Amino acid sequence: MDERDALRISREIAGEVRKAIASMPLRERVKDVGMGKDGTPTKAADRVAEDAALEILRKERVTVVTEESGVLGEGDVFVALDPLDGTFNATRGIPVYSVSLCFSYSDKLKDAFFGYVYNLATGDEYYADSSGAYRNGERIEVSDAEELYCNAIIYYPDRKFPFKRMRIFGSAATELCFFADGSFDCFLDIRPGKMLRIYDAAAGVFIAEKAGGKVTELDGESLGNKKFDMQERLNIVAANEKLHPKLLELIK
Amino acid sequence: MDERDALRISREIAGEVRKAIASMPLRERVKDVGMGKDGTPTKAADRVAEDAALEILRKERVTVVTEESGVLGEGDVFVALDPLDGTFNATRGIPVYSVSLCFSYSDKLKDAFFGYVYNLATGDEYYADSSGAYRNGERIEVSDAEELYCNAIIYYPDRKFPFKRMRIFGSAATELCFFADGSFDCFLDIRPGKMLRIYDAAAGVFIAEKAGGKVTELDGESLGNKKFDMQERLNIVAANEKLHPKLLELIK
Ligand SMILES: N[C@@H](CC(=O)O)C(=O)O
Ligand SMILES: N[C@@H](CC(=O)O)C(=O)O
Ligand SMILES: N[C@@H](CC(=O)O)C(=O)O
Ligand SMILES: N[C@@H](CC(=O)O)C(=O)O
Ligand SMILES: N[C@@H](CC(=O)O)C(=O)O
Ligand SMILES: N[C@@H](CC(=O)O)C(=O)O
Ligand SMILES: N[C@@H](CC(=O)O)C(=O)O
Ligand SMILES: N[C@@H](CC(=O)O)C(=O)O
Ligand SMILES: N[C@@H](CC(=O)O)C(=O)O
Ligand SMILES: N[C@@H](CC(=O)O)C(=O)O
Ligand SMILES: [Mg+2]
Ligand SMILES: [Mg+2]
């Protein structure tokens, strides 16, 4: 499997997940249908999204790591799949939610070869491969902001902060792309519980890095050894190379 | 002028603003075009929006209070107009932004008779009159949540908080509607600088109250004597009757 195959698979999935969710009324979407393997409830929207995705991934030699059904398959290529990221928004008709796919040649983030976040409400498509990062077919990159007085997405502000703006949209996979294309200047998830899971962030990270972002754990350690499993957890500090160290110091 | 005229006018305005913005590329939207009367830059998107609105409102015996052009007209009915709320998102292409109109029989909020917030990205329409509050022609009401462990929209969290979720979308007018239809359990703007302006909040406030929400100033003070002018600033605590007092004590 290569970055071209991945793009093809990722798009086929996006189309199906899009249809499935778009035809589903909010009263249907919001219903609890079971306990996800992640240890949180699967909403009817989650299950519908995941089924459409797994139907397609089933035909590839991959091991799938996915929120609701957990680890599936035996393949050598690993896929961190968030079938629906921002479910809470989706169940309320707030148009920030996505399907996220990160493809890796091992069970570690360092071997990623393809990242893909499709906005299910806007049809916006973000991906990155060896040729860089894209928003709807156009090369994107991160902002060149060097000042803490910038536009930040942050989970969660718990003290006074120097930022010009703070936003929290509820879809890390999508918001990481907002940072990737420069819409925002940095992305922080510094929650002490360490809540983010591999499928939430993997693609977002990969795309942000290809867009020139420096993306690291709370203390600046590499995300390379983050595992494609259900136990993995993440904090994230992501910004351009110059703003990044300033953020690291800001949160000590 | 009554509540029906208001709805008719608001819908006419919404159609024009929505068509104007949808045809406008992001690279055009984001351009600074002048300094607004509020003391912040007018973006090209702001101007296109405001001109569309004013072309329709100028045919009415109203005094208009609007972000970019300021106080206009001589009429006895006052209209707080945010021609584009969430401009930052709109320039981004992030689908949370609205046109907001609140109509009053004086220059104070207490004499409001109509509230209208239209999401320009989704086509969602929120309004309220003497018959209650609506999202897309359906009656809405606020959630009955009694616990601080709830879903909050809050500008800005500056300490540790007991909330289940925190969201900040960048359009107070729209987020006030999210609270109004119960998508969220409360809306808080507790920014010490007192940043909200009359046209950001008036319509949303009116709609929330009609949906059953209790909406006050930082100290439980009434919003009734808030002025339809450029000098007015607001903080907001908005939740149902039960949850509201708890939030009040939480933020002392
Ligand atoms: N995923 C898109 C295709 C694309 O992104 O170009 C679809 O709806 O089929
Ligand atoms: N947005 C909620 C839950 C969800 O989106 O499914 C959260 O993880 O905080
Ligand atoms: N998924 C959310 C839904 C809500 O808070 O309304 C929960 O844990 O309850
Ligand atoms: N999730 C919403 C987005 C919107 O309100 O446009 C829906 O398509 O139902
Ligand atoms: N209007 C905003 C835009 C931005 O922050 O990039 C400003 O203060 O510059
Ligand atoms: N707020 C969400 C964001 C996401 O699901 O990506 C979370 O805590 O996981
Ligand atoms: N403003 C809407 C009218 C409506 O809300 O029914 C439109 O553009 O058609
Ligand atoms: N006024 C918004 C951004 C904008 O719409 O210009 C903020 O400062 O958060
Ligand atoms: N603001 C965006 C909305 C969206 O992406 O759906 C646009 O009109 O391009
Ligand atoms: N989020 C707010 C920012 C402000 O008014 O200061 C708004 O644009 O409605
Ligand atoms: Mg779950
Ligand atoms: Mg302005």
From Swiss-Prot, chains A, B:
Signal peptide range: none
Entry EC number(s): 3.1.3.11, 3.1.3.25
InterPro entries: Inositol_monophosphatase-like, Inositol_monophosphatase_CS
Domain of life: Archaea
Activity control summary: Both FBPase and IMPase activities are inhibited by Ca(2+). In contrast to mammalian I-1-P phosphatases, is only very weakly inhibited by Li(+) (with an IC(50) of about 290 mM).
Enzyme class, first EC level, given as a word: hydrolase
Complexes and interactors: Homodimer.
Protein name: Fructose-1,6-bisphosphatase/inositol-1-monophosphatase
Lineage, uppermost ranks: Archaea, Methanobacteriati, Methanobacteriota, Archaeoglobi, Archaeoglobales
Record gene name: suhB
